[PDB]
Design a protein around this nucleic acid. Sequence first.
RNA 1: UCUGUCGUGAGUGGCACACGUAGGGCAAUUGCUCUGCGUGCGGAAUCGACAUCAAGAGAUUUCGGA
Lengths: 128, 94, 155
Amino acid sequence: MDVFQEGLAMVVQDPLLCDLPIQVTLEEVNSQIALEYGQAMTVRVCKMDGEVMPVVVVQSATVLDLKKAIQRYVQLKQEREGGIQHISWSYVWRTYHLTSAGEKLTEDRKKLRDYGIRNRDEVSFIKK
Amino acid sequence: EQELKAAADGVLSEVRKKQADTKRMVDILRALEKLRKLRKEAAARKGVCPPASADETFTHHLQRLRKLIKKRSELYEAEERALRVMLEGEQEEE
Amino acid sequence: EYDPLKAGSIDGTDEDPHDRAVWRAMLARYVPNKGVIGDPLLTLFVARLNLQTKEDKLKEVFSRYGDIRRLRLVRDLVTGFSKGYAFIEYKEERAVIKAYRDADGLVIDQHEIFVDYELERTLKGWIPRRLGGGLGGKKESGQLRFGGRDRPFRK
RNA sequence: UCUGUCGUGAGUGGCACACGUAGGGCAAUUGCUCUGCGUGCGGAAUCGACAUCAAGAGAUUUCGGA
């Protein structure tokens, strides 16, 4: 009773649609809509082993909103590869910070544009 | 009323859960179809590679898929109507 | 034979937890994750590595004790930060015991590494430090867990 | 002495609950109602946070309520 999966699979094979990770879901495609409209922006995060994950947020996204985007990206990642799914995000955000250009992103309420973050930027992790 | 609602809730909510799932593929193809459009505006330079084959292959996919989705929803709507017919039938006579 | 009770005491004579972390150790139940792989006999758990140490260098310096079947350095799941400890899986028990006796104190990237066996699936009732307990510790940090190779009991 | 339930890659997950916190609407300077986040009773000082188990930094003393 999952005929939609076959259709989604073949449609993804569109050369102008290869960016999409098999299972599409509404929030992922909608985020890339704002990418075409320019409202969104991609903020790259690199884990300390060098692996990079391209988290996408809106231009007016706040720091705390960016945090959930990482949660949304990571959580979506875990189901596809089947890793650990019950990430204790309370702990992860309790001990680690977010830093860009040597400035730690502490104010969850402040928006990334004032924190100097532009599209296609890079931010890293650091302990409390 | 509390157990009248719960009895309706037990069946009506379950049908909606599948119906919401049944609707969930519609907006997937709606959002995907939109995303296809704005990338063709950027494909004015990318249109060198054949988009007509790409567009033709894309369009025939959803239409059969959306036809099957509508066929499935007709089954679910009939049961939703039937459940609404039967559930309210019992509550008056009780 | 791990006992969170006596682990908090120098000579195994304490009958009452002197630390809430000891109390948490008794209550909490631990099972190794799905990431725990391989025969526990041959897993030489090493610790106190440098956070900049790469898993290749660990293979490079630990191959001198013999062939190495498998290796993993542990990093934080979400962040990627190295956790400062690894797990070396060897072949033949001759290699791991050689790794046991000499590699303890072996300086790697300006750090004196710590070497032990894998005590999860071998030491009864073993509880890691995260769940309260573990071994080693530092008496500076308001708590300590005796009974390990680093701090044997004062028997 | 300081919530319940379902869960085992999860003493750290899900939901609910309680308390606190940020933004929205309503009434009489205050009160009532919704969404996000923090802890599971809540503060202070000190020692740690560069500790031995596949991912998790806590602990000693102190004092406020129930």
